[PDB]
Design a protein around this ligand. Structure first.
Ligand code: V9X
Ligand code: V9X
Lengths: 237, 300
């Protein structure tokens, strides 16, 4: 069934599961031609495949060459996503394969189900949550590896850094969704909040700054303020 | 012209024979149906006046034997039987005709409706969908479930239609996932036509039989089968031209015959809108689209 507010804690139990977000797979810039028509130019994309319990990120970079000579690219992108997720599952040892895959967009259900027919016991589920994973390309190190790629490539990151040494998966996922929601609503402001104090650095193998517990509380409060405001600035309240 | 003798009519019942029907009163001196056209399968069906629940009936072909109906007061239904003594059966029928206790199959000469609905339907194929090998005729009723419905509970009483499932390994070649799901031509032409049905006549025969069981008995699993077999063709980009032209004729007569008051339950909105307006074959069913738009524009 669909994952929603009611069954949220299921994300942090011991059944392996993966979120798949396809938002950033097919990315284009729209521009004018010399004749004054409009055309698109593809840029590199990525599949965002995340284990919410462990923070394991399987970032499959989608190089623009995969679109060459193909038609109906937005449709193809869903099938390419499903092909790559299926290949990831087959590559994983049996004890590391997910029991469920939760797609962030319902249009991924049929492509993924068809590619996963060989795995009848892996549940393919939609969600009613409006998760902010599209903002993953606002994380600088993730955007950088996608843009620099010259061929298809899988890059493995922990999206929680070392947070699980001090907090539970539930709290880590809540922090991640808060950060990403902020970056989605007002990227510049969110990025200012995270970097305002230059003395708190990002470790070379981490994505986010090395905040203390107290500093994360302040940061999280700043992100919540930003989100509430923008919701005013947007709806005028 | 053949005859189906009734022993008697002890309970009040609406009797159908193909697309015709008539009401018989409790203990009315009714003794069967004569002048039944040879060359087609036929169906004789029943709805009791007290319990409109369970429509039921028998598919048969008079070339395969001499058949009669007799009510069973224990099982509470009109049963078809075969009389093996040809002289006993000719004598019975001759006497009933002399006493004019039979209704005549009321076919209008100009009227090709039944032929058009049963063109590809064969008794031998019916008997493989409805398995009861000791009889030459086949019982069907409103409640019987299909093999596919059962997989998703008595196997001897099931409708063994060919299972069609668009999200199945049979339908989807490894490595052709997107291609085969969006264009079902390989599942239609290689898996189903070449592989299982052998030819398009057998495919159309099962499609036509499914529709008739849906219409005459309100059999829900049969309606599902009919729509699946339509959708499989319409969702194939590559279909022999003779099949598309024949399908348009088949569906035209099915839509023409459907009772207007049953179109709400017997027609699946998604399938028909997809098939007539979105599918690869949206422009290949001219007669069917015209009758659907003039008779059921609401559904669309
Ligand atoms: N194969 C797996 O079950 C996890 C792989 C993986 C992806 N991202 C990571 C970050 C840190 C350690 C491992 C990983
Ligand atoms: N006369 C009877 O024995 C009644 C039942 C019966 C046996 N064989 C039949 C053939 C044709 C109509 C009816 C029957």
């Amino acid at each position: 069934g669909a994952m929603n507010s009611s069954n949220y804690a299921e994300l942090f139990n011991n059944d392996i599961k993966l979120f798949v977000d396809d938002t950033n797979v097919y990315r284009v810039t729209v521009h004018k031609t010399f004749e004054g028509n409009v055309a698109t130019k593809a840029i590199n994309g990525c599949i965002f495949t995340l284990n919410p319990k462990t923070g394991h990120l399987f970032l499959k970079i989608i190089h623009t060459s995969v679109w060459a000579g193909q038609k109906r690219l937005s449709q193809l992108a869903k099938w390419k996503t499903a092909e790559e997720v299926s290949a990831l599952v087959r590559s994983l040892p049996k004890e590391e394969q997910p029991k469920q895959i939760i797609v962030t967009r319902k249009a991924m259900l049929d492509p993924l189900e068809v590619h996963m027919l060989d795995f009848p016991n892996i549940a393919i589920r939609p969600t009613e949550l409006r998760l902010p994973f599209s903002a993953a390309m606002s994380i600088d190190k993730l955007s950088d590896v996608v843009m620099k790629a010259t061929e298809p490539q899988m890059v493995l990151f922990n999206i929680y850094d070392d947070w699980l040494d001090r907090i539970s998966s539930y709290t880590a996922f809540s922090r991640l969704t808060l950060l990403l929601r902020a970056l989605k609503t007002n990227e510049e402001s969110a990025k200012m909040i995270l970097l305002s104090d230059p003395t708190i650095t990002i470790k070379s193998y981490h994505l986010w700054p090395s905040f203390t517990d107290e500093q994360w509380i302040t940061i999280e409060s700043q992100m919540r303020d930003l989100i509430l405001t923008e919701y005013g600035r947007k709806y005028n309240v | 012209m053949n005859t189906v003798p009734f022993t008697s009519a002890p309970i009040e019942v609406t009797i159908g024979i193909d697309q015709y029907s008539f009401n018989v009163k409790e203990n009315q001196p009714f003794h069967g149906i004569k002048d039944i056209p040879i060359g087609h399968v036929h169906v004789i069906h029943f709805q009791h006046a007290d319990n409109s629940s369970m429509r039921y009936g028998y598919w048969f072909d008079c070339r395969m034997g001499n058949f009669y109906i007799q009510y069973d007061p224990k099982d509470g239904l009109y049963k078809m039987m075969e009389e093996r003594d040809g002289a006993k059966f000719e004598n019975i029928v001759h006497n009933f005709k002399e006493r004019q206790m039979m209704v005549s199959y009321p076919k209008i000469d100009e009227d090709d409706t039944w032929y058009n609905l049963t063109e590809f339907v064969q008794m031998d194929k019916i008997r493989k969908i409805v398995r009861k090998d000791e009889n030459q005729f086949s019982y069907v009723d409103s409640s019987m479930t299909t093999v596919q419905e059962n997989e998703l509970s008595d196997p001897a009483h099931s409708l063994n239609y060919t299972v069609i499932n668009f999200k199945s390994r049979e339908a989807i070649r490894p490595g052709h996932e997107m291609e085969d799901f969006l264009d079902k031509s390989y599942y239609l032409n290689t898996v189903m036509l070449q592989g299982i049905f052998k030819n398009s006549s057998n495919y159309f025969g099962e499609l036509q039989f499914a529709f008739l069981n849906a219409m005459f008995f309100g059999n829900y699993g049969s309606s599902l089968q009919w729509h699946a077999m339509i959708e499989l063709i319409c969702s194939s980009a590559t279909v022999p031209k003779h099949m598309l032209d024949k399908l348009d004729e088949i569906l035209y007569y099915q839509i023409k015959t459907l009772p207007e008051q049953y179109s709400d339950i017997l027609l699946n909105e998604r399938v028909w809108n997809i098939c007539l307006y979105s599918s690869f074959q949206k422009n290949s069913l001219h007669n069917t689209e015209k009758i659907m738009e003039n008779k059921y524009p609401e559904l669309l």
